[PDB]
Design a protein around this ligand. Structure first.
Ligand SMILES: Clc1ccccc1C(c1ccccc1)(c1ccccc1)n1ccnc1
Length: 272
């Protein structure tokens, strides 16, 4: 029950996803690994505690490395995973940027608005892509030969983590994830967007396509209100990206770690 525009639209997004989402992370390599005042630090210590995972690395030859992070002993060991996480984020961001740049609706926008939309939505799209490799039975993001496991059920208090569990519960299709990415990418209200009305119209068409996709392919009474649930999750995603953004900026304030691409997306000038 989708129109021809809508069917073309979903195809173009699925195409962009297929070309730019390295789902086995095969080309994530050369990354760093952990080695072998006052009220800021209290806040940053709390910040880093929420971002805590163990790391497993499965060698192509069959070997396995496992890293268990330290406890907070009041020092600098709380920063040990930041260079690795910066490299993973950077790698995800490159995929996100490539995703946007092959979408016709995005390429047609002026360059400054392209940049403003990517700066506004990079994290959100990264989180949506991470959700598709999140294993909610083991609390593990399965990134090909890398796995990141939550240290350990009072962790669902963390809004990022509650989001991943709730979104995974909806059992979305690939098409529904990529429409979510599009709706978040084409948010007309990001800082610096000039063409508000053009982006808003595009956003509305992505949401209408999603509504129609669901109505036509999900008749089960379990998926009643699925569209509205998804849209409320998108609002939650925006809110937690703002929280997560401020958290990384606090951490970055006292222990620098953003790569140049992360700095670009943050608007960090390299000046002081
Ligand atoms: Cl992606 C990211 C960047 C910086 C810090 C933490 C995370 C995190 C993650 C995701 C996949 C693989 C390793 C870490 C992360 C890990 C644990 C707790 C919070 C965030 N992530 C961002 C959003 N959802 C998950």
């Amino acid at each position: 029950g989708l129109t021809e525009e809508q069917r073309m639209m979903i195809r173009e997004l699925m195409d962009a996803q297929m070309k730019t989402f390295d789902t086995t992370f095969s080309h994530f390599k050369n990354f760093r690994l952990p080695g072998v005042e006052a009220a800021k630090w209290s806040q940053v210590r709390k910040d880093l505690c929420s971002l805590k995972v163990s790391l497993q690395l499965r060698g192509e030859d069959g070997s396995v490395w496992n890293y268990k992070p330290p406890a907070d002993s009041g020092g600098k060991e709380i920063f040990s995973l930041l260079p690795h996480m910066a490299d993973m984020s950077t790698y995800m961001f490159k995929g996100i940027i490539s995703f946007a740049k092959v979408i016709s609706y995005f390429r047609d926008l002026p360059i400054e608005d392209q940049i403003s939309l990517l700066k506004g939505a990079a994290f959100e799209l990264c989180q949506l892509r991470f959700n598709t490799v999140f294993n909610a039975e083991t609390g593990t993001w399965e990134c090909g030969r890398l796995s990141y496991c939550l240290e350990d059920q009072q962790l669902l208090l963390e809004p990022m983590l509650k989001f991943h569990y709730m979104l995974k519960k909806l059992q979305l299709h690939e098409e529904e994830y990529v429409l979510m990415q599009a709706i978040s990418l084409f948010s007309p209200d990001r800082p610096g967007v000039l063409q508000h009305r053009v982006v808003d119209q595009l956003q509305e068409q992505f949401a209408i396509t999603l509504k129609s996709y669901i109505e036509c392919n999900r008749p089960q009474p379990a998926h009643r209100f699925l569209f509205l649930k998804i849209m409320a999750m998108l609002t939650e995603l925006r809110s937690i990206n703002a929280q997560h953004t401020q958290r990384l900026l606090r951490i970055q304030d006292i222990h620098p770690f953003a790569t140049p691409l992360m700095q670009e997306l943050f608007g960090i000038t390299g000046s002081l």
